[PDB]
Design a protein around this nucleic acid. Structure first.
Lengths: 125, 116, 161, 260
RNA sequence: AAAACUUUCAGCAACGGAUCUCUUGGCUCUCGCAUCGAUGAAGAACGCAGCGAAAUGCGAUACGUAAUGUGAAUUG
RNA sequence: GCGAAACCACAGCCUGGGGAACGGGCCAGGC
RNA sequence: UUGAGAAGCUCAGACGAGUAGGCAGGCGUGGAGGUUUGUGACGAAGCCUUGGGCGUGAGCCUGGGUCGAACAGCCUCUAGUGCAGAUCUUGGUGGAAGUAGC
RNA sequence: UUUCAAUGGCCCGUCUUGAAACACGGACCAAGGAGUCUAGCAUCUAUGCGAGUGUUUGGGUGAUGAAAACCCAUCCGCGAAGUGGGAACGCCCUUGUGGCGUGCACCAUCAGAGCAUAGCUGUUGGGACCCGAAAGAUGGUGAACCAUCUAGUAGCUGGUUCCUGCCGAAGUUUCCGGAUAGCAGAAACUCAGAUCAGUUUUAUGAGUAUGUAAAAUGAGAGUU
RNA sequence: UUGACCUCAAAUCAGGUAGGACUACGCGCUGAACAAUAAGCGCAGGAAAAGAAAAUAACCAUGAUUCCCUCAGUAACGGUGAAGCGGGAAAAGCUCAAAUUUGAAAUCUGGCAACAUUUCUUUUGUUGUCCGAGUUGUAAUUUCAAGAAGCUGCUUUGAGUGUAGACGAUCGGUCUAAGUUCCUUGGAACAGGACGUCAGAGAGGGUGAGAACCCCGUCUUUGGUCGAUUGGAUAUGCCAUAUAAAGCGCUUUCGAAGAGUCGAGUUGUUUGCAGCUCUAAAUGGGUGGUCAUCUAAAGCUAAAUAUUGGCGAGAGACCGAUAGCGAACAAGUAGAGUGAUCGAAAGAUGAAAAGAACUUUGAAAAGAGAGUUAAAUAGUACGUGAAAUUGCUGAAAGGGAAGCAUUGGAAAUCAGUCUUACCUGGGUGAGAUCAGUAGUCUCUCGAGACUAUGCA
């Protein structure tokens, strides 16, 4: 149960906040779990996704697939993973969007900003 | 126009939060000032004793508190009320005297020039 | 529904949201430090005043009082002197201890004399002695400021110490 | 309540009587399809609904304070009858005793897993498991209105002084924790049904005599309150009817259902 | 009397948008707060978006510049 | 070729009698 | 003899039009508290049906088809709760009619 | 289910009218669509307490929603201000029969019952079941037009939504729009060893009938 | 004459300020109809207004204002309709005019020059000097509750500026528990079953179907942490124009109190108010019952109170697209009217556009072969797809109606069901609730659960 009068349990206001969120909020809304190896080595459970991240698809028809994240589609809350495509009528390959919570991060595109993020969120390297 | 009382429990909470707000500012002194004991002005009620507005000047003079000191230690002064009988005087003089017994007045720093 | 409120609904700009809703939390205590240290933040101000041994109201209370556990002639009013009151709590003793010690520190009420004040009173004494202050005030030549006997008496007293 | 101007925002007038149409006022002007459309009425589209709801309907209702104390006393009594607990939907079939009183060391539990261990030791977790399994999505428009889910009621834990018992029990689905000094009929007879499964601490059970008093001695915590008296001393009517005192003077009973 | 035509029933196809389900909307109540303008307001007009259906944003520094923060997007 | 609107309980042969109009429905006759 | 929902069971006789009006018990709808350790993607609700059943009736249960995410029985609470009419309101659609006509 | 045969079967609602005749409303279907909320009053029932009764103006309090629940200081409101018949009981004792006592409520003859809440019903106000009647006034825009007051005013018009069962009139005396009464129900009373009747008689009288009084027949009756 | 003072003007002179908008609440003025009514006009603020008695009362007296409850549907009036008391919320008091500073205009704005200070290079002051204002009166002092002046001896004192830390408020960062294991269904697992974990977190939302453990969050948090801006105190350094300024006490001395107002007559608006005529007093004047009470004709003032607007927030036994705001969407939009004004209809493909490539017919729109999808009975005329209505097909009926009811026939079409068990054997083996049996566990000897052995 929530006891703060500063947070709303209203489904109307929760749905409006999620679907009307700005880009700097959808960066956090699009978070993915880390693999057990990374999770117990970086001391971090989940991180927001990013391009060049290496992920494994965990749920859906494409379950078990792996690949880098070519681009994150924050408008529709979708990830676009390389070689995870669908053939069209004319044979052109249309990429398939995957929710960020349906993948797991097996390798992190480490940067100084993310390295600072790890030590910030109780992590280590 | 129809007045509705849906803010009745919200006024109760708001008034209590004001008492807590007031007490935070003035930490150890009472949230109310001491009121005198008077008798209501009718043949229906003159047997009852209730609280007045402030103490008369003749009640403060007997108790030993001046009318300028009185306001500073939480004793209201009523310049309008008077003591037409010795019972009203003694009932409220004792009330002031008891108040002074239970009162701690914290000392104040005083400006003190070098000479003169 | 208003055109002004509909305007910010149709905009892309965010609201000036201010998260200030905090009920059931009581005001934190400042002013006295002794009260602040011994003040708990969950109890009401009545419960805290009673616990610390103070009086929240010097009058009656206009309602019930909580019961948590079951309980187990003008001469003698004017010339009397009430013998203060004991301190029921260590907080009240702490408050009382501070008040007496601080008042003792700030007790130097007697004043010295300046260069003019000393020379003024000294000249008056050298002519009229130290006991006749009425004739001291009536001497216009030396008492230029026309101080009365009571002011000159207080000048001499401050010069003694 | 509805808006104080809904169904009357438009402007219309009665075109007249005898013009081969209903005499309801029709919106004036032109260019919009509102031309000729009726309003200011319950039947007409975008019209005033009959008797608009008002905010000054009586929302609250008074009860004499003595009736309320009677109901809470009668609801506490019902919680000491295992049959009434079972008939209200509680899985108390393995509870060691009713009333179920636990030690005062329960009042200072800090962790939920400490509370769950106690419920499993006194076999009171069968009721919590019932509440967890009963969680369904609410039917109707109630779930569009912040009433998303429904479930059963678990045990009611009654303490005397709080030392973590509330925080250690509040996250268990179904369990409600209350103080013995402010017992609530909404929690003692949920839905108006008697026989709530209540777990007491030793200190709460020892303070029940001061909260309610006796039928002859006044309650300590309620000024001038005495427990209600009963119209019958012994409520076993079978015991009175089939007693030696009464059956010795009754005339010989005729047969049961008689032959035709 | 069979056909046609008419009627009735049923099947399929149209027509229509009821019902059901929901819903970033409304309505109501409560709570906190006090902040327009000759230092040019509210409103109106005209312009700028590479294209944007409008709508929104902005003002010739035109869907903004500076600074700070997050740290890799934008997206039809 | 483009194309309405008023109107619309349902209907549609007479002859009589049917008391209240009864003929358009009812009753006995023709069609 | 088990036939004590004593609010049950049982025996007997008489009686049965009905406007205004009086009284009693029931059916159905939206939401609320409780309950069914309830139903549901192995198909909820809705709709369709010359499928079947129950009730004097309001109504209810069910098969088949369609469908795609919620929903119901019981006790109580509540109300914007039940339509054939109002030259009713909104929407859709007919005969007149391929007519009048242009 | 369709269809056939035999027999029967005037279009529904409204108003009118003994009745109909009527005149109205109805092209069809879907959805919406009309006794509601609230204040006061009175009856009745239930519930709590009872010479009392009513916590919620407010205060205290409530950590798990804290607008809930729980608690009550001072007021105040409303209340307080002998003889017969008879329910019920005991004792008999010819026992049933009756008698002897004790006699509630209430009626004839000369030892406070309230207060609060809930529901039902009736009633009076508010828009007041819904749709209905020219407006008028204020302020504007170019005699006219527009906005609001307005949900203005209705004795009148049309409409007013599920089922079953049980009771069931009157349609008019009389005074005079009425207060009565009558008709029809509800409750509390007392009675079947008591009374009653769109009854028939007997006989007294009075003038074939008449009223009165007292035999048959039927039904338990009288009330407030 | 010079020259002062009073005027009357001027300046694109310096520094300022007013207008308009909003108007839910607030305060004035004005005003009809069906009442301080709507409108109309004027003016504010975060509240406004009111407010420290020319007030009540008749008591053992009360004591500014405001709001709530009560008084009370009462008095009174002619259905309207208060107030005193009483109970609560909140409480805070004061400032002038009327006195000679007269042993000293002690007062103030501005210019200029320095020195500071900042929510701030934006702000706000200090010191010095000059000019002006001001004696037709600026300060100190006084406000009736008093007070002044003397006298007396007790108790008192900062409009200063830094440092440090603590305690508060506000703004912006940061810190945060646990399954995505196995089986089944499915396009998808968020479903079912199994085995687990976390829980001061089992709120809510998202994610390809009901997710405490996938994600954001939620709880901890009625806080830790990092900064920024601030408030009232504490401690302490320095400075302090005190030759000063106060309270109390005492009197062979004094004690000013608001006028075209009060009031009287009269005329209007709604007693109050307003006009008009007249016009005061000094223990006087006002209001009450000789007495009591108050002290007008000058001013300020937080809190409790109000709030359909503004900036946010949290909710609900509310409505669920003919509902709910007119407006869930291009909504005060399209559109209409010369104008004032008026003012709609309109939500839903799928998890994903994977939005139908390609071949073919056609002038084209489209069609047909295909193709995607779990589903095209989801193809943007897109969820479900009722009724009225229409087309085609099939069956049946049919002399100027249909038409429904009752009873059957015919045709079509359904429910609608079955023997399968009981009794009695015998044989064979089987095993426990059987043992001329041994143990364990949970309750309480013997009752259940098992284990080993025998199957007489």
């Amino acid at each position: 149960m929530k006891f703060s009068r500063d947070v709303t349990s209203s489904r109307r206001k929760q749905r409006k906040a999620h679907f009307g969120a700005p880009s700097s909020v959808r960066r956090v809304l699009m978070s993915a779990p880390l693999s057990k190896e990374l999770r117990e080595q970086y001391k971090i459970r989940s991180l927001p996704v990013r391009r060049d991240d290496q992920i494994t698809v965990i749920r859906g028809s494409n379950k078990g697939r792996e690949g880098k994240i070519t681009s994150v589609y924050r408008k529709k809350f979708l990830l676009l993973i390389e070689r995870v495509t669908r053939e069209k009528a004319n044979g052109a390959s249309a990429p398939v969007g995957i929710d960020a919570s349906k993948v797991v991060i097996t390798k992190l595109h480490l940067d100084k900003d993310r390295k600072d993020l790890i030590v910030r969120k109780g992590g280590k390297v | 126009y129809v007045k509705t009382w849906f803010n009745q429990p919200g006024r109760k909470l708001r008034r209590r939060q004001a008492r807590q707000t007031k007490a935070a500012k003035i930490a150890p002194r009472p949230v109310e000032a001491i009121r005198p004991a008077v008798k209501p002005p009718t043949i229906r009620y003159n047997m009852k004793v209730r609280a007045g507005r402030g103490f008369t000047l003749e009640e403060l003079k007997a108790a030993g508190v001046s009318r300028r000191v009185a306001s500073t230690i939480g004793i209201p002064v009523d310049h309008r009320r008077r003591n037409r009988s010795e019972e009203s005087l003694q009932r409220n003089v004792e009330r002031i005297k008891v108040y002074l017994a239970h009162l701690i007045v914290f000392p104040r720093k005083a400006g003190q020039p070098k000479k003169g | 529904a208003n055109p002004r409120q509909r305007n910010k609904q149709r905009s892309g700009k965010p609201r000036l949201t201010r998260r200030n809703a905090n009920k059931k939390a009581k005001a934190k205590i400042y002013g006295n430090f002794v009260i602040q240290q011994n003040w708990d933040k969950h109890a009401t101000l009545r419960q805290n005043y009673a616990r610390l041994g103070l009086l929240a109201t010097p009058n009656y209370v206009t309602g019930g009082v909580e019961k948590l556990y079951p309980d187990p002639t003008l001469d003698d009013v004017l010339d009397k002197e009430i013998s203060i009151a004991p301190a029921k709590t260590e907080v009240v003793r702490q408050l009382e201890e501070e008040a007496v010690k601080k008042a003792a520190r700030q007790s130097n009420k007697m004043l010295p004399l300046s260069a003019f004040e000393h020379a003024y009173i000294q000249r008056l004494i050298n002519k009229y002695g130290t006991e006749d202050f009425e004739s001291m005030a009536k001497d216009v030549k030396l008492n230029s400021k026309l101080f009365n006997g009571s002011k000159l008496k207080n000048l001499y007293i401050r010069m003694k110490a | 309540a509805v808006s104080e101007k809904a169904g009357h925002q438009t402007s219309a007038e009665s075109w007249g009587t005898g013009r081969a149409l209903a005499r309801i006022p029709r919106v004036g002007g032109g260019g919009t399809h509102r031309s000729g459309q009726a309003a200011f009425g319950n039947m007409c589209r975008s019209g005033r609904m009959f008797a608009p709801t008002k905010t000054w309907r009586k929302w609250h209702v008074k009860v004499n304070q003595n009736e309320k104390r009677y109901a809470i006393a009668s609801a506490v009594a019902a919680s000491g009858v295992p049959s009434l607990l079972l008939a209200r939907g509680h899985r108390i079939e393995e509870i060691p005793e009713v009333p179920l009183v636990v030690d005062d060391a329960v009042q200072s539990f800090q962790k939920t897993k400490e509370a769950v261990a106690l419920l499993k030791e006194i076999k009171a977790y069968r009721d919590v498991i019932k509440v967890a399994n009963s969680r369904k999505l609410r039917a109707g428009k109630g779930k569009l209105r912040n009433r998303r889910h429904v479930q059963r009621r678990g045990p009611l834990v009654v303490f005397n002084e709080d030392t973590g018992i509330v925080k250690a029990f509040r996250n268990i689905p179904g369990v409600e924790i209350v103080n013995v000094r402010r017992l609530n009929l909404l929690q003692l007879a949920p839905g108006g049904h008697l026989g709530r499964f209540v777990i007491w601490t030793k200190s709460a059970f020892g303070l029940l005599d001061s909260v309610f008093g006796s039928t002859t001695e006044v309650a300590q915590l309620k000024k001038n309150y005495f427990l209600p008296e009963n119209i019958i001393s012994n409520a076993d009517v079978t015991r009175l009817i089939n007693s030696d005192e009464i059956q010795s003077i009754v005339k010989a009973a005729g047969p049961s259902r008689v032959k035709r």
